[PDB]
Write a protein that binds this ligand. Structure first.
Ligand SMILES: [Mg+2]
Ligand SMILES: [Mg+2]
Ligand SMILES: [Mg+2]
Ligand SMILES: [Mg+2]
Ligand SMILES: [Mg+2]
Ligand SMILES: [Mg+2]
Ligand SMILES: [Mg+2]
Ligand SMILES: [Mg+2]
Ligand SMILES: [Mg+2]
Ligand SMILES: [Mg+2]
Lengths: 243, 233, 204, 245, 234, 244, 238, 250
């Protein structure tokens, strides 16, 4: 077995292999997430609609359990591995314990997996950040994020990937009790945030959300152009009718 | 006390090339030449058994080796690497027979050994085999001739050459002979294509040949060799 | 005994340029029938079938694991398995469990994929093979079956006089065995076709 | 010859001219050590070492460079002590396993070939480094007589009549050739061992020192023992007095 | 320049262990003070965005009812050490049916000290030190106690101690304010006074964590309100 | 090509741009390091082993100074090159041989033993963790119906049988000599074979050595047991060469 | 620097820098001293404090009833070796129901710490040790270094500025063997003081003493417990 | 040891795996290979590189592999490396068939082989496989499907795509001349010879300089076949013997 130490500290106290992993995350398709009160939303930017492609076989959005799901940004292959490992842990948390998987628990698990891979011989870290979504059954709806370092925090809303810095600067200036105070408007802020950096076309997005009790729902490109018009023109009822 | 290198010694360069494999082939292109001809009723293998001094006992070692009752081999390149692969092919040949009770199909033996050669281009601590083989066999009526090189890739040839002047030795055959050639015929055009580079007095101890007809594989004796040599036999 | 837990009978016969293989259909656990439509004969390529008797679980398992191997063999080799070779393949699979064997004694019946050659054989639960030019039996009524066979089999038989011969051997043997029966099925393989009939038999 | 461009970092690498610099480098460690000598008398083998006084704070007997590897075999070392000590444990273990298996005291030639192969094992890979030490093995028995062997960092092993390792390998030999050990008795060799030590010892550079003497022969009854203080002093006096000449 | 993780510098110090001590200087600052009436721990969360839940940031955690611990540096790494600690306290309780002293707990964690390496190692073996500094505060048979531990594996007891980027400054202030006879009330005030200084951001009740452990009360993580109460006296 | 290098092709056994293995080559020079030369000749009824015995010191029990090893009672060998490596390879040969008989029921053929030792060395040639052994091995003995055999194996994996051969510093000079006398080849009797061996070594080293300056090993069809000549009877051959 | 990073690499001078570097770790540690009469073994050491609000580092540890040690160098390595030493002793009592002969324990440290100095990827232990014990051969003071080498001493001292202490000890050796405990301890405390900056000396806060002897099981003294020894100490530097 | 390890599974300052990228390079030099998705079938067409007048070639194909009974694939890159990844592909198929007694869902056989390549890039110190593969098949979940895999352990389903030499000129071409939703195995084979005639330094794209295979349904059992010499040329001539007829319109 290969025992080389891949991730090591440097003169000033840095872990380059982690910082490099973090860089791969940066070169990834933007991904934003907003935490509402009745429905949490997530949308995956730069979906490079090559058309000759096939939507289903590449959606940067996935469900882990029946009460949790996630979005990622970074090395595609890595994500797969991490996705299917959390999926497994989800069912195994039910065989050891009887109750289901929590909002945080599963996120912590993923963070622990990533952290480990930054301190084990023979391994490279995972080049992906994750936006984990889900409502705390018998409680509030939560949102969490993870980066290669293995650190994790709960966000009110957030973005990771290409230009996530921008979308983040934006999100920080649009989130309010009022802004998206209803499922109709909640799924909106994301739509705006994504677009606020998302290439022209709308055929570059792939949003979707989960209800505080219902299964998951991957929106159709139809309900897309609609909510992409309810604001495409709403971006004129104050920008073309007051400008 | 020994450990082991777990990292691979072969790795893609930016040109996308697998350097060690090319270099392995270079060891091949620099080895004694070998020719193989599929005569549609038996195959022939022959190579240049150039021994330095006369002190060498040409007998004690062979380059044309029998794998099974119906398979055979020759190489071009590093002799010691060959030997390793001969023991592994013979072994692979038995593991097949014990399970199936039928002699191993030539194509199958090639595939298996090729997999090994490929193994040594990815496993840690090792270098690719500096050799290329020419496997010949009579499996189910049709005669077969194959070649697998360092990369672990193989091909089936109607005839070919490897080693020094393999470029010229090929083109020569690329015309100096063709299908329908009967037994003894393919043998002559083979020892000839050999001389098309064989520097020196090509005698019956300067070469070694084996044939594979649909009735087993064998090595020809210095006699049958001294014969074909006189430009006939 | 373990072998007679699910009961069962299997037989193969050799004709001129054809081959037959039949099996009862009962799937029971000791005295109790559980099913009447239990498959015990499996297709292992065209003109090649394997019949498994014995313990139900291993019947299913030995068959499924054998298919696994048969498929890859055919994907690596560029052909269709030859009977004598499938026999050697099952002989290997069974003997790999020499000291904790599967409880099933297989019966192989088929025609050469590239020849007329009819072929039949049976095996040990540990993989020892047996090839004959007449017939082979396996199951809880080996004795009854040998009885019929040594009195009904004729050297050369056309597909129809083979079907009527193997069909009689079964139904009559299986009717003097309490745990075999509930219907019989027959497979007659000819270079050109595959005739599959489920005979009319007792259901007790 | 300054060869050493990567060709001297691993024991698993040959230099362009057929050398293994790591082993050679290990020997230097030995050439820098204090001299130890062994001489096969007619009724045993005698050992002497120039154990330098590292500090006056150290006890007499600290850093011994002579050990009992088996009750009938003695070991005299030079070079990196810690390396030597582990080689002494291996020697002991080897001699102990032999008795358990074949049921009799190990023949010095075998104990030597064995330990030597262990030493050699460490000169083939990058995974480990050659022992930076050399040692002599001495024994006596009536069915084998007296035997003296010497192994070095490369694994090489040979039998001697007399031999030296350390700072003054050379200087010690030219002095041993003056004796006719083949006919000499062990009781008389002690003197000569201590003699060759003072001669060779550099009064200048290397400061004060101590003398270690090992015993093994008909005089010890086959058991390798330390030389009795009495014999040591006599041999020290004789060595010192012979020095004033 | 590429060498093994277990290489010494000419100075007789392991490069990695030195390079992680460095990493701690990039962590947030935390302070721990020990009083005869209890121990308190305070740390600046160092929030980097309004959209980030200030609560989903715990630099102070419970090891066991009688022991709290504050961290600084590569927090992802501290996750592991914190767990080993909690697990250790329970193994002790399981086996001996009694609580583990604060010193023994700190020590247990310290044994994972230089437990890193490449060759001759297991598969689930660390490949580098943890870039973390820790402060174990708690109360046991020997009264209230505070211990500090860095990556070298060294640990010691302190009347008051500070770790993190502002460590140097913070410790200077702590030396000016500590009294062998002060109180848990005085202690907490100092902590926040000093923490307030060193922080680059204005001390909020939502950007700091404070907790205490006293001879009577089992570990307590100050509430958003209880912070208002103490911050009231800036 | 033309002596080119790339990467570590000069530090570990990996291919060079030309397709060569420098470490295997550096391993050959390593043989000469000992400064000795060895020769082996195949008679019609025997096989002979001869090598220098440079013992510049009088403090060594000349008895313990050898390059002649008894592998089996019917197989003897001569090592040339780095000593420790050699003893090692000798031990492996003894092992592989003792094991062959236990496992198969009959003495290992000189032919096979050499092929074995050879195969082993091949690995060091393909694996980087270790270096090849800087030594050469020559084995001799009488086969069942093949009479006397003489084999030598490389620090490169090559192995072969010869009418005669050499190794060491003067290997290339020793071959030119032998191959020239194998053409004039009189009746390859026991005496001639032994005589031809001694001279080849004496003339290439131009020494006319004493009986203590060389060692001679021999195996005979009439006495298959490997035999190492006494210093006394060695001289008996030396004198015999002086009568002319 | 091609010869500085791996303990498996000998330098062209027959030295192993990694080993030497590890030795440097000892020198850095605060000084410690050891000496024995003919009936007692004594360890004395100076403890350091990171800041004024932190406690002083442990320097003396209990191994077994008849053995104790003082450390200098990496603390984590001290704990490893200490635990090995403790384990080895527990085993002796378990199997033989007798205390592990101090010299035999020292040989084990020697063998154990030698291994890593010869294998690729491993590092020398980075700690020196002064060992004070008492077996049926009397008092003993041993020294062990990062290089698996060890020493049997009459008296000794390792650490920063330990050269002074060594010098002081070398001057009063002849006195030691016949000293009665308190006098022996004083010589120790006195030697330690040699390694300090003239403008400061022994405090009951920075001194630690370890004593084992025919009449007493290894015992450690750290704060007020050190007073009794500090009293009667001529503040007469020399 | 540390000195000779090239670190084949480490991140670069950019945040990319250089050994994966170099494998790609090797791929973009191998025999061109592509597949298009129809509604009645799916196909694979590859640049037969073992083109030479001496080879005896005794295989159903040279770059076409039968995996499942409902699947086949083709490769671009190191052939030996490919023989390894396919063998493993066949095994993953059978393990599924054994366990569930039903053909393995197409995409699933792909994610399987991908997790393995992905691994060779995260740990092990080994070099990745120098292979990119095209997968075509049918499964009762999405019927006909075409998939592509990179040595990075990455994949996607394509209605149409290409791999290998000029795997850029081939894309864009199809990317515009592709009937997204209205393709027949015939209109498919169309672009096939059209695009291969383009990206392939060959004039009058001979029948040998190519290998074709098609997968279709057919009364239950799936059918996989490689066009015979003649059957190939029909589309050869059809392309040109329609092209000169295309310039009589300009
Ligand atoms: Mg796609
Ligand atoms: Mg964000
Ligand atoms: Mg050749
Ligand atoms: Mg059929
Ligand atoms: Mg019945
Ligand atoms: Mg009934
Ligand atoms: Mg050696
Ligand atoms: Mg003298
Ligand atoms: Mg003696
Ligand atoms: Mg090598």
């Amino acid at each position: 077995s290969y025992d080389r130490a891949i991730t090591v500290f440097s003169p000033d106290g840095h872990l380059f292999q982690v910082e490099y992993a973090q860089e791969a995350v940066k070169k990834g398709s933007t991904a934003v997430g907003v935490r509402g009160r009745d429905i949490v939303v997530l949308g995956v930017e730069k979906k490079s609609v090559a058309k000759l492609q096939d939507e289903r076989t590449v959606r940067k959005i996935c469900a882990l359990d029946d009460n949790v799901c996630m979005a990622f940004a970074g090395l595609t292959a890595d994500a797969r591995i991490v996705i299917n490992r959390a999926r497994v842990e989800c069912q195994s948390h039910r065989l050891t314990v009887e109750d289901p998987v929590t909002v945080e628990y599963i996120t912590r698990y993923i963070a622990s997996l990533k952290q480990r891979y930054t301190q084990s011989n023979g391994r490279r870290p995972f080049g992906i950040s994750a936006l984990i979504v889900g409502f705390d059954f018998d409680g509030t709806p939560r949102l969490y994020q993870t980066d290669p370092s293995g650190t994790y925090h709960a966000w009110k809303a957030n973005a990771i990937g290409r230009g996530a810095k921008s979308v983040r600067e934006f999100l920080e200036k649009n989130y309010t009790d009022e802004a998206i105070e209803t499922d109709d408007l909640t799924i909106k802020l994301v739509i705006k945030a994504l677009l606020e950096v998302v290439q022209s076309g709308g055929k570059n997005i792939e949003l979707a959300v989960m209800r505080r009790d219902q299964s998951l729902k991957i929106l159709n490109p139809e309900e897309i152009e609609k909510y992409v018009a309810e604001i495409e023109k709403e971006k004129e009822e104050n920008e073309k009718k007051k400008q | 006390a020994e450990r082991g290198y777990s990292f691979s010694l072969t790795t893609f360069s930016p040109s996308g090339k697998l350097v060690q494999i090319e270099y392995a082939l270079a060891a091949v292109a620099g080895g004694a030449p070998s020719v193989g001809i599929k005569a549609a009723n038996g195959v022939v293998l022959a190579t240049e058994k150039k021994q330095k001094s006369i002190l060498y006992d040409e007998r004690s070692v062979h380059k044309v080796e029998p794998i099974t009752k119906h398979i055979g081999l020759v190489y071009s390149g590093m002799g010691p690497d060959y030997r390793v692969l001969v023991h592994r092919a013979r072994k692979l040949a038995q593991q097949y027979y014990l399970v199936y009770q039928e002699p191993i199909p030539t194509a199958q033996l090639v595939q298996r050994v090729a997999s090994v050669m490929q193994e040594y281009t990815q496993s840690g601590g090792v270098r690719p085999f500096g050799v290329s083989l020419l496997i010949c066999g009579w499996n189910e009526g049709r005669p077969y001739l194959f070649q697998s090189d360092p990369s672990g890739a193989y091909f089936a040839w109607k005839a070919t050459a490897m080693g020094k002047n393999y470029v010229n030795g090929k083109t020569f055959l690329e015309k100096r002979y063709n299908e329908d050639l009967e037994l003894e015929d393919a043998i002559h055009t083979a020892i000839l294509t050999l001389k098309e580079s064989f520097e020196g007095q090509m005698t019956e101890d300067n070469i070694e040949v084996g044939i594979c007809n649909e009735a087993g594989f064998r090595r020809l004796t210095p006699t049958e060799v001294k014969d074909y040599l006189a430009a006939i036999a | 005994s373990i072998m007679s837990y699910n009961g069962g009978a299997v037989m193969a016969m050799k004709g001129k340029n054809c081959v037959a293989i039949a099996a009862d259909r009962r799937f029971g656990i000791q005295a109790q029938l559980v099913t009447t439509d239990f498959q015990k004969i499996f297709p292992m390529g065209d003109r090649l079938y394997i019949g498994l008797a014995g313990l139900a679980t291993d019947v299913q398992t030995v068959a499924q694991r054998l298919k696994f191997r048969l498929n890859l063999y055919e994907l690596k080799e560029g052909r269709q398995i030859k009977p004598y070779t499938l026999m050697s393949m099952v002989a290997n699979l069974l003997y790999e469990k020499r000291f904790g064997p599967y409880y099933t004694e297989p019966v192989i019946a088929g025609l050469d994929p590239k020849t007329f050659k009819p072929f039949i054989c049976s095996l040990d639960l540990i993989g020892c093979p047996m090839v004959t030019d007449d017939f082979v039996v396996s199951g809880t009524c080996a004795e009854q079956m040998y009885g019929m066979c040594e009195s009904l089999w004729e050297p050369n038989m056309d597909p129809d006089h083979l079907f009527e011969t193997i069909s009689q051997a079964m139904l009559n043997a299986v009717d003097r065995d309490a745990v075999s029966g509930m219907g019989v099925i027959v497979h007659i393989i000819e270079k050109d076709k595959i005739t599959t009939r489920t005979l009319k038999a007792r259901m007790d | 010859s300054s060869i050493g461009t990567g060709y001297d970092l691993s024991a698993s690498t040959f230099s362009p001219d057929g050398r293994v610099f790591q082993v050679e480098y290990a020997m230097k460690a030995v050439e820098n050590s204090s001299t130890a000598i062994g001489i096969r008398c007619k009724d045993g083998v005698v050992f002497g070492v120039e154990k330098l006084v590292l500090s006056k704070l150290y006890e007499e007997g600290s850093n011994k460079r002579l050990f009992n590897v088996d009750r009938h075999v003695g070991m005299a070392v030079a070079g990196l002590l810690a390396d030597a000590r582990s080689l002494a444990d291996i020697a002991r273990e080897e001699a102990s396993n032999f008795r358990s298996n074949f049921g009799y005291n190990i023949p010095l030639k075998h104990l030597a070939d064995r330990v030597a192969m262990y030493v050699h094992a460490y000169t083939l890979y990058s995974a480990v480094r050659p022992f930076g030490c050399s040692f002599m093995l001495g024994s006596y028995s009536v069915n084998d007589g007296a035997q003296l062997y010497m192994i070095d960092p490369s694994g090489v092993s040979y039998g001697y009549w007399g031999c030296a390792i350390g700072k003054a390998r050379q200087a010690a030999k030219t002095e041993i050739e003056k004796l006719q050990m083949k006919e000499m008795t062990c009781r008389d060799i002690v003197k000569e061992v201590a003699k060759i030590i003072y001669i060779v010892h550099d009064e200048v550079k290397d400061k004060a020192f101590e003398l270690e003497l090992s015993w093994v022969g008909e005089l010890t009854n086959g058991r390798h023992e330390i030389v009795p203080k009495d014999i040591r002093e006599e041999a020290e006096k004789y060595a010192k007095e012979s020095l004033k000449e | 320049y590429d060498r093994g993780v277990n290489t010494f510098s000419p100075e007789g110090r392991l490069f990695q262990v030195e390079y992680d001590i460095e990493a701690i200087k990039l962590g947030s600052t935390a302070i721990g003070i020990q009083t005869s009436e209890g121990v308190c721990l305070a740390v600046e969360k160092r929030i980097t965005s309004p959209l980030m839940e200030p609560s989903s940031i715990e630099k102070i955690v419970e090891i066991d009812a009688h022991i709290g611990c504050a961290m600084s540096g590569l927090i992802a790494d501290a996750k592991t050490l914190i767990d080993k600690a909690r697990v250790e306290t329970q193994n002790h309780w399981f086996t001996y049916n009694e609580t583990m002293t604060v010193e023994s707990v700190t020590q247990a964690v310290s044994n994972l000290a230089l437990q890193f390496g490449e060759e001759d190692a297991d598969p689930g073996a660390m490949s580098r030190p943890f870039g973390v500094a820790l402060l174990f505060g708690g109360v046991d048979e020997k009264g209230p106690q505070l211990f500090h531990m860095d990556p070298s594996g060294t640990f010691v007891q302190c009347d008051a101690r500070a770790i993190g980027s502002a460590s140097e400054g913070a410790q200077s202030s702590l030396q000016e304010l500590y009294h062998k006879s002060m109180t848990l009330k005085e202690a907490i005030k100092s902590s926040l006074i000093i923490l307030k200084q060193v922080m680059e951001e204005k001390l909020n009740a939502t950007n700091i964590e404070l907790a205490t452990v006293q001879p009577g009360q089992n570990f307590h993580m100050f509430t958003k309100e209880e912070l208002e109460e103490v911050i009231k006296d800036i | 090509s033309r002596g080119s290098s790339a990467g570590f092709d000069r530090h570990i056994t990996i291919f060079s741009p030309e397709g060569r293995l420098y470490q295997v080559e550096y391993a050959f020079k390593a043989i000469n390091q000992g400064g000795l030369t060895s020769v082996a000749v195949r008679g019609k009824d025997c096989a002979v082993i001869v090598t220098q015995k440079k013992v510049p010191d009088k403090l060594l029990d000349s008895s313990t100074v050898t390059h002649l090893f008894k592998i089996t009672e019917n197989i003897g060998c001569v090592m040339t090159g780095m000593t420790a490596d050699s003893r090692s390879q000798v031990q492996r040969a003894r092992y592989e041989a003792a094991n062959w008989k236990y496992k198969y029921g009959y003495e290992i053929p000189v032919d096979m033993l050499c092929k074995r030792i050879a195969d082993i060395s091949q690995v060091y040639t393909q694996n980087a963790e270790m270096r090849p052994l800087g030594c050469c091995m020559i084995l001799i003995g009488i086969d069942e119906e093949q009479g006397p055999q003489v084999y030598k194996c490389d620090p490169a994996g090559y192995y072969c049988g010869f009418k005669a051969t050499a190794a060491g510093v003067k290997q290339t000079e020793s071959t030119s000599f032998l191959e020239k006398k194998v053409k004039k080849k009189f009746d390859w009797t026991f005496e001639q074979t032994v005589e031809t061996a001694i001279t080849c070594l004496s003339t290439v080293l131009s020494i006319d050595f004493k009986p203590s300056e060389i060692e001679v090993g021999v195996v005979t069809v009439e006495n298959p047991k490997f035999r190492i000549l006494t210093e006394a009877e060695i001289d008996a051959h030396l004198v015999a060469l002086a009568e002319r | 620097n091609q010869y500085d990073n791996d303990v498996t690499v000998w330098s062209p001078q027959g030295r192993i820098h990694q080993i030497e570097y590890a030795m440097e770790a000892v020198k850095q540690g605060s000084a410690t001293v050891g000496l024995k009469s003919k009936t007692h073994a004594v360890l004395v050491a100076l403890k350091r404090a990171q800041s004024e609000l932190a406690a002083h580092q442990k320097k003396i540890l209990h191994v077994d009833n008849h053995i104790g040690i003082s450390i200098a160098g990496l603390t984590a390595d001290a704990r490893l070796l200490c635990n090995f030493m403790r384990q080895e002793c527990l085993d002796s009592r378990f199997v033989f129901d007798r205390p592990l002969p101090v010299s035999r324990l020292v040989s084990l440290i020697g063998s154990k710490t030698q291994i890593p100095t010869q294998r690729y990827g491993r590092r020398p232990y980075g700690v020196g040790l002064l060992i004070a014990g008492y077996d049926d051969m009397g008092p003993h003071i041993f020294q062990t270094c990062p290089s698996a080498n060890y020493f049997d001493c009459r008296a000794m001292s390792i650490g920063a500025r330990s050269q002074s202490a060594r010098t002081y000890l070398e001057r009063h050796m002849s006195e030691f063997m016949e000293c009665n405990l308190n006098e022996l301890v004083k010589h120790g405390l006195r030697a330690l003081r040699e390694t300090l900056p003239a403008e400061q000396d022994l405090t009951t806060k920075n001194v630690s003493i370890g004593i084992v002897g025919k009449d007493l099981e290894f015992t450690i003294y750290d704060d007020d417990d050190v007073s009794p020894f500090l009293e009667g100490l001529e503040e007469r530097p020399q | 040891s540390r000195r000779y390890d090239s670190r084949t599974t480490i991140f670069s300052p950019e945040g990319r795996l250089y050994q994966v990228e170099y494998a790609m390079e090797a791929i973009g030099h191998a025999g061109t290979c592509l597949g298009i998705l129809a509604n009645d079938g799916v196909l694979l067409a590859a640049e037969r590189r073992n083109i030479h007048k001496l080879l005896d070639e005794v295989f159903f194909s040279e770059k076409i592999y039968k995996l499942n009974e409902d699947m086949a694939c083709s490769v671009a890159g190191i052939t030996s490396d490919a023989n390894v990844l396919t063998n493993e592909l066949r095994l993953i198929a059978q393990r599924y068939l054994l366990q569930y007694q039903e053909p393995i869902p197409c995409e699933q056989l792909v994610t399987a082989l991908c997790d393995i390549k992905q691994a060779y890039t995260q740990f092990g110190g080994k070099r990745p496989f120098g292979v990119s593969l095209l997968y075509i098949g049918w499964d009762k979940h999405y019927g006909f499907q075409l998939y592509q895999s990179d040595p990075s352990g990455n994949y996607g389903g394509w209605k149409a795509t290409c791999i290998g030499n000029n795997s850029a000129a081939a894309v864009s071409m199809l990317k515009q001349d592709y009937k997204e939703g209205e393709m027949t195995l015939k209109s498919a084979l169309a672009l096939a010879i059209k695009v291969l005639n383009k990206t392939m330094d060959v004039s009058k794209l001979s029948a040998e300089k190519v290998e074709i295979a098609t997968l279709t349904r057919e009364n239950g059992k799936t059918v996989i076949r490689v066009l015979k010499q003649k059957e190939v040329e029909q589309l050869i001539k059809k392309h040109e013997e329609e092209e000169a007829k295309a310039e009589r319109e300009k």
